[PDB]
Symmetry: D2
Subunit: 388 residues, 4 copies
Amino acid sequence: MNYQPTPEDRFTFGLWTVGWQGRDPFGDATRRALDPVESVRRLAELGAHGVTFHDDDLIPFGSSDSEREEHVKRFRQALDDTGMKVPMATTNLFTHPVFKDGGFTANDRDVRRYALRKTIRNIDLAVELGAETYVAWGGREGAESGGAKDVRDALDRMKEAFDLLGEYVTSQGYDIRFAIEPKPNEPRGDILLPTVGHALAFIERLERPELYGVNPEVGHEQMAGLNFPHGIAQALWAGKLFHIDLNGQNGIKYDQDLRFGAGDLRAAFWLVDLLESAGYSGPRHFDFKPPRTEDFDGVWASAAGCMRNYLILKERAAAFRADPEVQEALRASRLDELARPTAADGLQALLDDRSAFEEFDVDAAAARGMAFERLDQLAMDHLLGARG
Amino acid sequence: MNYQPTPEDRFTFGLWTVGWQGRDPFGDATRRALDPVESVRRLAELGAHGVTFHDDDLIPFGSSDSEREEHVKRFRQALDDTGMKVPMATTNLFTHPVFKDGGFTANDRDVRRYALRKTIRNIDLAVELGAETYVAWGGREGAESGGAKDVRDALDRMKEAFDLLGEYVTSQGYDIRFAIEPKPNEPRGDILLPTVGHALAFIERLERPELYGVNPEVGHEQMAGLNFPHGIAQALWAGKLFHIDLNGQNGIKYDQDLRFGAGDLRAAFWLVDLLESAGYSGPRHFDFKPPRTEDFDGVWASAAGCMRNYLILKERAAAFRADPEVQEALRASRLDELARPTAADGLQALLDDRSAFEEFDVDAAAARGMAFERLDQLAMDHLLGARG
Amino acid sequence: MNYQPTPEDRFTFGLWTVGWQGRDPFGDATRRALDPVESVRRLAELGAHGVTFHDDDLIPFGSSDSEREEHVKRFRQALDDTGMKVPMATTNLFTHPVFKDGGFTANDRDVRRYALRKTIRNIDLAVELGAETYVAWGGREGAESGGAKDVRDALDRMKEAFDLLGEYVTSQGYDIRFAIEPKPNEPRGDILLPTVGHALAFIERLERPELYGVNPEVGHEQMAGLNFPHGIAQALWAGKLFHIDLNGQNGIKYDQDLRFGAGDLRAAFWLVDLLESAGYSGPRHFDFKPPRTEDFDGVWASAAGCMRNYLILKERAAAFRADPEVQEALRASRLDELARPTAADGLQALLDDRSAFEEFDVDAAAARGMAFERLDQLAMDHLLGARG
Amino acid sequence: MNYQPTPEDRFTFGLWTVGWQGRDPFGDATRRALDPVESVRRLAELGAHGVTFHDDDLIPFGSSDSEREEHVKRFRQALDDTGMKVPMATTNLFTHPVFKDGGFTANDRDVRRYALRKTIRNIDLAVELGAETYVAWGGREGAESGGAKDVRDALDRMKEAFDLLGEYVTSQGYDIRFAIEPKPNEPRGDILLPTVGHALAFIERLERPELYGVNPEVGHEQMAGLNFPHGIAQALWAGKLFHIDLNGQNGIKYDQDLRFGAGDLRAAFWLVDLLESAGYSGPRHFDFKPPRTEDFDGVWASAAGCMRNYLILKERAAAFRADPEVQEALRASRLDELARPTAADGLQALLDDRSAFEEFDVDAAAARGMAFERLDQLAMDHLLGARG
Ligand SMILES: [Mn+2]
Ligand SMILES: [Mn+2]
Ligand SMILES: [Mn+2]
Ligand SMILES: [Mn+2]
Ligand SMILES: [Mn+2]
Ligand SMILES: [Mn+2]
Ligand SMILES: [Mn+2]
Ligand SMILES: [Mn+2]
């Protein structure tokens, strides 16, 4: 209708998304490896704006300097050939067995130091490629057992690491900012900074908090049964939504990484409504895995579907908010009053206001319906294109 | 052996715990109401240190001033008769139908103002009774549907409310501090500030953050599938564990409020280990419900079991930490190294250290086992009293 | 468009749905009680086909015979006035404190006998009102602790109870059949027969299995994180879908009882697709609760929304299945081949078929993509009305 | 004390347990491959009774006949050298990419036929090695999307497959029986036969149901939030507990496969209590993964811990059941009455018994406490070795 993405829509994809070969813990690869150059070309043809990478997605672990230079050269040529951007990069601190107990919070100090050096090397590369955001997903930070990890000590180590990275970027005069990606579990039994809230709270204890925000992922918050739009709202309220990862998840299970729109469809609607109403200006990044049932045609169909679903939901959310009948229902439900200060008159005036206590008619207020069901059915009708 | 509590152990109980009449949404009351005086006497006989209350537990909603005075007088006499303390109090902003859409974040502004006045009245009472901590559980703050609640606006209202309460306590010269209690859901479909992390993050945006901490509850974090000891560790790391609620929960379901030790027993062990190792000095408060299957004899047995289980776990955790074989296993697993700074030498030294990158033997480090399973089996053996 | 229900659509509602007064465990009632006569009239005006009841919804517990007769007379007049039917009835074996440890599986034998007599009395009433199905939801059958309930003994008692009920209906020559409603938890910590599968398995051990089927509820299976359409498919496969309860649930939490279509919208789509493709001919019954935020206008809006959402989804699922492009995608994904016997040639022929083992080209088969993502995006486009 | 296993305890392990190399979806191997001969020797030294295998654990996929013969010969020599048994075997119908959409319920018919031939070949081997039980875990049977898999058709295919296998074993005169292993999800978004109940129900529709039972796994049922002891009780009630897999899981997340005793410790206690009270005579099989943090010393420690924890729990459960104070508490809680028939007098006598209805004192019965909390605290005290 026809919901066709173009680079102006700012849709981005990780190399590791469309490039996922399909290995799962009970299963071998179902697809051959993709050359990053091919991924860049195919994503551009679909209307993507850019790509993102872990160090080890772009440059095989253990590469020589000559190999590294050539991998980067080929990638840059593909970006130049297509007009694709690289808005974000990140470090792989989870695949190699050296990181089995963590990177920044490994019990082994030598591993912690190595993790920092590996990250710093890739920050330099990210800046060279034009990235504005550097993500950190501490997927190995955590434990399967209680004695293995003293979390206060681990948080001290995690703060030290992020503070050193902030010192580094400041010393180099780089404009790049960090986005910490929470996840509750998987691959560790419990992961440190398990939700958006825990990550937001941790950032406030860093030496230079302004350099750090969050990179929430739809499926990660949903793995804790949380409301992803609500958590995004809190991140926006805090001024900390530096990046976002979009995908689908069906509740509380392993991280499915379904295409965006799959999983909890209504949550996807309310997320798009929020991002668009708030004027979020960052990339709409997809961190998803085309299911291992698919061949490459299915990989590109799944990637296209991520963007299509965002655009359909954008249309429906805008129509919802613009509909005079919805605007009336929002007033009927007192969403306008929610946005007004409780006591701009000040504390003493509130204390002196008999209408707030002695003369408050509690039963009359209690009897007033909220009209939320009518409002929500208008929302459903807009999502489904069942208005009239 | 025999794990007998005394007031020196600082165990406290809400009036609403042992006083729960057994109504659930599919069920009528199974027990008669308890007079608070009787609860104070019976808890003291069990070795409790004190009790806590919502306003409406102590003074029936809608009471006259003469009725209020008499309810408080009788309660104070029972406290004096027994030596019981009142370390914490809180407001009921959830039972009355006026609070069906919230107290502090109700869409209706008049309800928000009333909620604040109801709280302020009870802060005065709490201070009169000697409470150090004032808990706020915003159980009605949230939504069942996406359009009903704009979370950025609701967080603005929530901040306004807590800021006004901080202004109030400061204006009165009170020493009392606030503890915000997160919960992910129930009774609302999703509750605002759903976890310890979200609450910690929110506090940092208040005008006087030093006045506010968290009151985490075992079962609430477990309703999001989170690791309660880990979340307590983050609260301790932040200096924000102002109070704690102890109970049991079996995973992801309705809030069960089982007695402490029930539900996730190993998590209970690691929690006690953490509180005791950290020297937490606040009350060990039980927010639990004796199951509705029980008569009053079972109510008091369940309350006694809360304290007994804490004391057993305290003994076992202390024995674990003191055992030279465990101390050796902790070193074998590099818990000592986790507690050492990563780079006290500083950023430039780390950047110049070839042992951290070019000359780091990644394969040798990767080959070193963590020895976590042996450590955890020593922990299991200590918990079960199966050492030798 | 405009998705208007009429009695021919066979939509039914429990009296306890629209009549829910809004009490939750942390909250008092937000709505006055509804007279069943009023509910019948209001539901008929919305286009409902009928209503269902627990004994105690229609006749207050403890009523005299004269009171009982009058309650039933008034209800029958309302049914006659409106043309509403009563296709299903059930017993309340959960609200009264006598049932705190169960009805049919109470540890107390006298309670088990009473539960059976209470049920039998209401079976007679159900038959008088024309009900074809008698539901049993054993919400109190289960435990909070391991020693409280020996499940083998409880299953013996549960079988005895259902066998006695089958003997009763057979002895009276009644045509009514039973539908057992599974639920995993709430109000008990764990409920016996927690899923559709457990209930199906139990039925096979009854003396007269043909008299018993299941009454699955959307939200109950989703409280165990299960796929409700899949479970319905297994019940249909077994010939045991005797009734169904439709509502919404957001994953793993307390039973929300949201209106149908809310909660997991895509699961609602696939459910409707399955019921309609299978030709399920039973009532489309809504077991839901208008949120306690609502006044009566919101109650009726929420009930109307249940039916509206079913009808929208019915339209979209039919359009999906009828679309030649979808029919082609289904063949591309080998749904046709799934429906063909694996080895109609028989075991010996399979054993002798070299194409099934020695000469099977495993790599060629593995390379063939399933094309499931394209199929699922066609399904999404149909659900959202985004085709063209 | 010291909880030392010996072969008489009938503890068994899969080759794939201790042999797990540590690959997870975000991580490469952390341990070298183990020769099955070495695993047999090391497990025997720990006091194991036997081992189990998938075809592809023992014989690399794609092996020639000469290679196959030699792999089996070496394995048999190790079994003979140690006295280890092989009580169970199974087929790998999940790792190879050909099985990406299933084995027995693959949409591709040629894959379904191949899956059956692969299984049949391994049934022959299992019988040669003396296995009594043949497990089937359909880990790839299921879907990520609704259109991909018609579950009624898939259940038809699954029944055909199991019926053909039953025809095969009967035709060969083998004594081996099948055990179907349910799992709710992972690696598929939803797996067919997701719980013990669904598997039990499916078996009743097979042509020769007596040949089939279940192989429940602790962590699988817990991935649906279900009570594993309750599900085992239902399997025992049905006469269908043909095998069992023991491990640990912390609730609703990816399948952790922790050592037995880890995860939900109290559920482990009640499971052991049930198996021992019921006289279950099958192997106590561990399907677990030593965490990838561990070296080989940690692998063997984790395996030893599985057995140790079973033996500790066995001791504590026996002591609980034998304690006269517990026996009294069980009577106080009416567990004796739960085990008595409800109405051995028959239906007519129940209908004629005024004590069951008109003269039943509902309030007196309701007032009687169940005494479950005292019983459960005795259970806790026994588990923790805190009696006296
Ligand atoms: Mn993910
Ligand atoms: Mn991500
Ligand atoms: Mn709670
Ligand atoms: Mn609490
Ligand atoms: Mn329900
Ligand atoms: Mn229902
Ligand atoms: Mn498993
Ligand atoms: Mn298994």
